[PDB]
């Protein structure tokens, strides 16, 4: 997160960190046994880290659970990044509490202009490199489709939306992928891709969650 | 540096060619339109169009 | 056309050559005043050449007419090549006759396996360069969508189809763009793009004409 603020420990209790010897992506706890991340975040031998704040220090609110299975969306297209969503089942159920809660799934699509919350342990620089150890937050609005398409001509699909600032300065970045875009207490997006970070006229591109609720629900019920 | 396995081209004289290769961390210091993912490590694609593409890699 | 045969003069009377000091693309005469080509073939100061066989010799059946206007499809995406279609209005009406006729537009989509005719003045080599001066023909079938998508994962849209041979050896090539794909006396496709020419598992990709009939009809009526 570029140009954001320090969330504060356990202020985003549905936020998870995906670890494979190091943090490589984010995710969101949707229930006690399932996390939703980005399909491009797929990898094997993943451990899920809950209740985290400083990912480099055990502060005592954490739960570390291995994934038992991962299911990438049947139509994920790694070339255009269409359908950038994946489901991960925990080896054992998380213990939900104050610092460790799930996030509600949308029942409808959010509209342009709506203010959302984006969080991650991603790079903190548009140019350069500086990774935070603590969770960073950003408030940003959903840009109109027409604005989205003017920014990335020929690349935005119906399962994507842009959020952020056309002037740049504030945005999600490398290390934030898989993480949540939350609006009106619902998970509406998933950090996906972009052109650099926080660049002028190059806002962030997110997975349009609302278009997947059914597949989510069905998938979870059968596994 | 610039090279290209998957290359796509229109069948025009001359062709407008692009590379459908997905590289890691960055895009060539010979690319004008580099788009990457927000994870670590990032996956990028160079969407520039050219009257040709580059040669294989490896 | 790679691995095709010499059509024979005026055997494909709806075939046009697009000239800008040289042949750069093909097209199809759909009526006396309008040609349909590929949107990627757009350029200004175009002359249309009808009744052609040897494009380097005036054989006396030709009609050379300048375009008066060109209209690229409102949603042409030059990045993915979706909606690769464009309409060109002739400065004056062509004189239709035996060697110079229009081709009928489809009333429905053709099905996989159907045999079509592809023609062009394109490169004759998969590797190398050799341009013909006379019109070349190819008979090739429409590949199933599933076959199409296995060939070019993540790139085929609903407004595209593959035709040709998975084993390679026979295909359309550079210089053939804009030209016709004709099946059961209807224009079903437009030579568009591919990965090299006549490569194994890399058949040709065509514009699915059937999906544009209405826009065609309406556009022509208002200009």
Q: For C173, which of B6, B7, B11 is closest by C-beta distance?
A: B11
What's the first-to-final CA gap in chain B, in angstroms? 11
For C83, the closest chain A residue by CA position comes to: A154
- Residue C48 annotated as lining a ligand binding site: no
CA distances from A23 to A91, A141, A178, C49 (A): 19, 27, 11, 62
Q: What does DSSP assign to residue A213? A: H
- On whether the CB atoms of residues C141 and C163 are closer than 8 A, the answer is yes
Residues of A with CB under 8 A from a CB of B: 22-25, 38, 40-41, 78-79, 81, 120, 122, 152, 155, 172-178, 191-197, 204
Q: Assess whether C177 carries a catalytic annotation.
A: yes
- Dihedral sign, CA of C129, C135, C138, C144? positive
Closest chain A C-alpha to C149 CA, distance in angstroms: 11
For residue C72, the chain A residues in CB contact (below 8 A) are none
Residue C16's nearest CA partner among C66, C76, C69 is C66
- Whether residue C78 and residue A154 make contact (CB cut-off 8 A), yes or no, is yes
H-helix or E-strand spanning residue A96: none
Three-state DSSP class for residue C148: helix
d(CA A92, CA A33): 7
For residue A197, the chain B residues in CB contact (below 8 A) are 38
Q: Are strands A86-90 and A63-72 parallel, antiparallel or unpaired?
A: antiparallel
d(CA C7, CA A117): 63
Count of beta carbons in the 10 Å neighbourhood of residue C221: 7
Q: What is the dihedral of CA C175, B28, A73, A217, to 10 degrees?
A: -130
Count of beta carbons in the 10 Å neighbourhood of residue C132: 17
Phi and psi angles of residue A209, each rounded to the nearest 5 degrees, phi first = -55, -40
d(CA A195, CA B42): 11
Count of beta carbons in the 10 Å neighbourhood of residue C178: 33
CA distances from C52 to A36, C10, C26, C118, C137 (A): 60, 7, 11, 16, 14
Q: Got the DSSP string for A21-69?
A: SSEEEEEEE-SSSEEEE-GGG--SS-EEEES-SSTTS--S--EEEEEEE
> Do A1-12+103-210 and A13-102+211-223 have matching folds?
yes
- Whether residue C174 and residue B15 make contact (CB cut-off 8 A), yes or no, is yes
d(CA A203, CA A192): 11
What does the block give as tokens for C14?
A: 């709806």
Which CATH code of 2.40.10.10, 3.20.20.120, 3.40.50.1370, 3.10.450.350 fits the domain covering C13-102+211-223? Answer: 2.40.10.10
- On whether the CB atoms of residues B18 and B28 are closer than 8 A, the answer is no
Phi and psi angles of residue A196, each rounded to the nearest 5 degrees, phi first = 60, -155
- Dihedral sign, CA of C63, C68, C74, C79? positive
Strands annotated E in B1-58 = 7-10, 17-19, 22-24, 34-37, 43-46
- On whether the CB atoms of residues A131 and A122 are closer than 8 A, the answer is yes
- Report the length, in residues, of chain B: 58
What's the first-to-final CA gap in chain C, in angstroms? 34
What does the block give as tokens for C134?
A: 């006379």
For residue B49, the chain A residues in CB contact (below 8 A) are none
- On whether the CB atoms of residues C166 and C194 are closer than 8 A, the answer is no
Class of domain C1-12+103-210 (CATH, top level): mainly beta
Which residues are paired to A187 by β-bridges?
A182
What does the block give as tokens for C115?
A: 């045999």
- Whether residue A175 and residue B34 make contact (CB cut-off 8 A), yes or no, is no
- Dihedral sign, CA of C200, C121, C116, C156? positive
For the annotated catalytic residues of A, the residue numbers are: 40, 84, 177
Subunits that touch chain C (at least 3 Cβ pairs < 8 angstroms)?
A, B
Closest chain A C-alpha to C208 CA, distance in angstroms: 19
Asked how this structure was determined, the answer is X-ray
- Map tokens 């998970």 to a residue: A187
Domain B1-58: assigned CATH number: 2.10.69.10
Closest chain B C-alpha to A212 CA, distance in angstroms: 20
For C79, the closest chain A residue by CA position comes to: A154
Q: What is the dihedral of CA B11, B17, B22, B26, to 10 degrees?
A: -170
Q: Got the DSSP string for C69-114?
A: EEEE-TT-BTTTTBT--EEEEESS----BTTB---BPPSSPPPTT-
- Whether residue C24 and residue B47 make contact (CB cut-off 8 A), yes or no, is no
Three-state DSSP class for residue A217: helix
Closest chain B C-alpha to A192 CA, distance in angstroms: 6
What does the block give as tokens for C126?
A: 């998969």
- Whether residue A80 and residue C80 make contact (CB cut-off 8 A), yes or no, is yes
Strands annotated E in chain A = 5-6, 15-19, 23-29, 34-37, 47-50, 63-72, 86-90, 115-120, 136-141, 160-163, 180-183, 186-194, 204-207
Task: Report resolution (Å) to 1 decimal.
Answer: 2.3
Q: What does DSSP assign to residue C41? A: G
Q: For C77, which of A78, A79, A154 is closest by C-beta distance?
A: A154
d(CA C88, CA B37): 40
Count of beta carbons in the 10 Å neighbourhood of residue C217: 10
Please check whether residue A79 touches C, CB under 8 A: yes
- On whether the CB atoms of residues A116 and A183 are closer than 8 A, the answer is yes
- Cα A167 to chain centroid, rounded: 23
Count of beta carbons in the 10 Å neighbourhood of residue A129: 9
Q: Got the DSSP string for C190-213?
A: EEEEESSSSBTTB-EEEE-GGGTH
Which residues are paired to B5 by β-bridges?
none
Where in chain C are the domains?
1-12+103-210, 13-102+211-223
Burial class (CB in 10 A: 0-12, 13-18, 19+), C51: buried
d(CA C192, CA C204): 8
For A155, the closest chain C residue by CA position comes to: C79
d(CA C137, CA C115): 13
């Amino acid at each position: 997160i570029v140009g954001g603020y320090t969330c504060g420990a356990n202020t985003v209790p549905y936020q998870v960190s995906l670890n494979s010897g190091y943090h490589f992506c984010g995710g969101s706890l949707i229930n006690s046994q399932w996390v939703v991340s980005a399909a491009h975040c797929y990898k094997s031998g993943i451990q899920v880290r809950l209740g985290e704040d400083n990912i480099n220090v055990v502060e005592g609110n954490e739960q570390f659970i291995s994934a038992s299975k991962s299911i990438v969306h049947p139509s994920y297209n790694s070339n255009t990044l269409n359908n950038d969503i994946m489901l991960i089942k925990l080896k054992s159920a998380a213990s939900l509490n104050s610092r460790v809660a799930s996030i509600s799934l949308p029942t409808s699509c959010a509209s342009a202009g709506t203010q959302c919350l984006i969080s991650g342990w991603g790079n903190t620089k548009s140019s350069g490199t500086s990774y935070p150890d603590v969770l960073k937050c950003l408030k940003a609005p959903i840009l109109s489709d027409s604005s989205c398409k003017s920014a990335y001509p020929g690349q935005i699909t119906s399962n994507m939306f842009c959020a952020g600032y056309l002037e740049g300065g504030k945005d999600s970045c490398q290390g934030d992928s898989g993480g949540p875009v939350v609006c009106s207490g619902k998970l509406q997006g998933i950090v996906s891709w972009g052109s650099g970070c926080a660049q002028k006229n190059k806002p962030g591109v997110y997975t349009k969650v609302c278009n997947y609720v059914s597949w989510i629900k069905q998938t979870i019920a059968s596994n | 540096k610039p090279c290209c396995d998957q290359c796509a081209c229109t069948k025009s004289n001359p062709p407008q060619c692009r590379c459908s290769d997905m590289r890691l961390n960055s895009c060539h210091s010979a690319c004008k339109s580099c788009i990457c993912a927000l994870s670590y490590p990032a996956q990028c694609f160079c969407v520039d169009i050219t009257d040709f593409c580059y040669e294989p890699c490896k």
